[model samples]
Target: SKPQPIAAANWGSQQSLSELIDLFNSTSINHDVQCVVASTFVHLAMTKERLSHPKFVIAAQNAGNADALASLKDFGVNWIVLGHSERRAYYGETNEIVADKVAAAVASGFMVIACIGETLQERESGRTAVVVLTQIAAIAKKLKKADWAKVVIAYEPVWAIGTGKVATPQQAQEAHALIRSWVSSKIGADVAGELRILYGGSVNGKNARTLYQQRDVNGFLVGGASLKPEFVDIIKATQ
Candidate 1:
């Protein structure tokens, strides 16, 4: 299978939720690039809004509990993000716990953005690939190959996040390629190619075009800059 264009997981806050929604509803958002709304509050707020755009989907930022998954389902949410570094560092989310969250979400019939990343210390020690693969392997132990059809892999390096230090195109492509290879070995080449592998590390409109141009870099799990109108430009770059 050939690689597809980039998508953007809009990980903005409640304050900027309306902006993201507006951007999605705008005419500038190219139909080719998908936008997954990775919000906790926006999904809850816009529960009744008719989702007209096929490229626009909803994803919860944290699926650490059953109630969260249920909330998303009630809101007609199709996707959820799990195992983010914030969840692990701030909320004490362990690998086993994340796996449990994934299982629960899948059981509830929701797609997942299964995030895996290396910390600054881990990256500095040259343990990025090992750590990411280990995390995925641990999570895979809890899910069958078929379950992977409902999952997207987001690779966000901790050192690059929010530091205005985005990963060089080569660095992002290398990690994304490694992840694709890992998926191919674990699941198969077919599923691996079909699976969307998103990048997440200081991703904004300025660097988005270069990053999204990479072969294996299928999308972005944007952080701070996703709150701004510039996100529309990032989405347009995929077109």
Candidate 2:
């Protein structure tokens, strides 16, 4: 089983994240997988009290350069999310830039959650595999095979994210399996076998079970559902 990182940005005696923590702790199920991620602002905003939970894992959301990566490492962060769809579209972060960032993050000993997926237009036109392969390939070109374990690819179809349309199970698995194929080709079968790829878009209790059953869809990078009580149901679904 894999883990999910709680938020360090919302730390202290009892905040929103604490409520989520309480929800998690209240459940006997999925206990071994609790963790927390500190956003890019986590370093500057997080308090020592944030580390109170044993499952807490510090991770940067989007790291920029070598200096930024070093700062995350210095701030005690252990992981990072690279190539988020929003970053690619809104911030103009290219695949090459994400690849370079992934290399820097791994070199700094920070685990990477590299996000990759297709846009609506890309998927509609049946370019999903091409887009995903290229994204993974770019990162693979930068990282050593040994660093494969240090990475988790978060597949987020942009159109499905906030658009109220979750990807069909077949589509998700199709892309997920294709992603594994790319991994197997570039890094070798052994390394590819253990790699975890997370589904990011439109995950909630309603569809959690359907998506989680896929062979390559290891877990999820929960979005809107995270703040709602349904978040607990999502975790429960994993059990």
Candidate 3:
């Protein structure tokens, strides 16, 4: 199956969340766009009239354990992001820890965007594939065959994230292809073919269209750009 183009925005702004929500509400947006808001903003998004439109489903930036998942479900959020590089860096969350969290969230019935990537140091040293493959291997062990459908892999190279730098289209495709093949061998070719692999890291409207042209680049996990008006451009790129 060809994976549906999906764009998930990580809303981590200290600025007004409603402004961003309002932008999406009043404007036309593709139905596959998703807004993964900060944990504090879930209630606001869910309560607002147009924020709940099918065009933008609310997703949590992080759900540490079963308790967080349960509380988010109460707010009508069915999607959560896990294993983002920031979590791995700042919070010292290990691969095993992320794997455990993913298993718990999925068992609790939440769809997840499982993030995996390498840092500048690792990449500069030519260990990109090794690092990413190891990260996915840990998570792969925790999931059941049926859980694959509920998972989306976001390959946001830590070096590229929040640094105003993005992997070139050629660079992004190579990494995504590596990830897809790893999934094929470890799981099955069927699941790999259907997996939606998103390229994230300083993705903005200016570059979204071209980055999206990569064959294996299924979608995006947008960050800073998602907070601005140009976020609409990124959404339109998928169409």
Candidate 4:
């Protein structure tokens, strides 16, 4: 059985990171709630220092290049959020490029929260599975069976990302089921059964509980809600 649900907050380019860390330090949250520090590179070390608790892990939003992945390891970063849709759309991060970065991050011994999902356009065109699965396939090609345990897949539908529209629990569960099924078929059932898949979009405290209850929904990669006080509540939902 999956041990417990993990709640990961993606503090994307947010300047209030210091205050947020301070808030988390003072608040009471579930032991399994895992928060990530995605602060800009300059502030990463400082944020890592503030997150003294083991539950708060450090993550970098982008690896920049394969060589850059090494620099992050020195900053106490344990995870890298690779293949985010923004990276693909805004920065020309193609499937091949993301695959290379994932390989490099894993090689450097950093855990990866690999993001894969369909855009509104892709979903509307009924290409949801095709798009998301293709993305996962790219990363899978670059990883080995031994690497699967260090990877956590976060399915963040591009349409719902920061758009205030959350996927229904059923919608998220169906997508997760598709992903797990694909992994079982191509990667190995043992790998798929042990993998942790997270649903991300506009996940907040109010919507977290129901989504958490979904069978294949292992956790969340929170966006806007990760910056608010309600983030504490989202973390507590796992308890």
Per-model C-alpha lDDT, please?
Answer: 0.74, 0.69, 0.80, 0.81
Give TM-scores for every candidate, taking all chains together and pairing residue i with residue i: 0.88, 0.85, 0.90, 0.92
**Model 2 segments more than 4 A misplaced:** 1-15, 25-27, 30-34, 38-48
As for candidate 3, its clashing pairs are none
Candidates sorted by TM-score, descending order?
Answer: 4, 3, 1, 2
Per-residue C-alpha lDDT of model 4 across residues 1-239, encoded as one tens digit per residue:
66456778786343577688888888766476566655456777778777776677778887767567766776567788875666765575688877887788888898888888877888899988898889899999999999987898999888888888999999999999999999999999999998889989999999999998888988888878888888888888775
The sequence of per-residue lDDT tens digits that candidate 3 reaches over residues 1-239 is 34877787776443466677777777776455454443344454543444744566767776786677787788777888875566776676788888888888888888888888888888899988898888889999999978898888999888888999899999999999999999898899989998999999999999999988888988888878887888888888875
For model 4, the stretches where C-alpha displacement exceeds 4 angstroms are 12-15, 90-92
Best by lDDT: 4
Candidate 2 lDDT, tens digit per residue, 1-239? 33342221211224765565566556454444544444545433442334455554656677776777776677666777764566776676788888888887888888778878888788789887888888888888898878886788778888877667888778888888898888887779877777777777778778988887766777777767766667667655553
Judged by whole-model lDDT over C-alpha atoms, candidate 2 comes out at 0.69
Candidate 1 residue runs with Cα over 4 Å from true position: 1-6, 12-16, 47-54, 89-92
Superposed Cα deviation of residue 87, candidate 1 (Å): 3.0
> What are the runs in model 3 whose C-alpha is more than 4 Å off?
12-15, 30-50
lDDT of 1 by residue, 60-112 (tens): 66666778667668867767787465566557577777787787788788888
Worst 10 residues of 4 by lDDT: 30-39
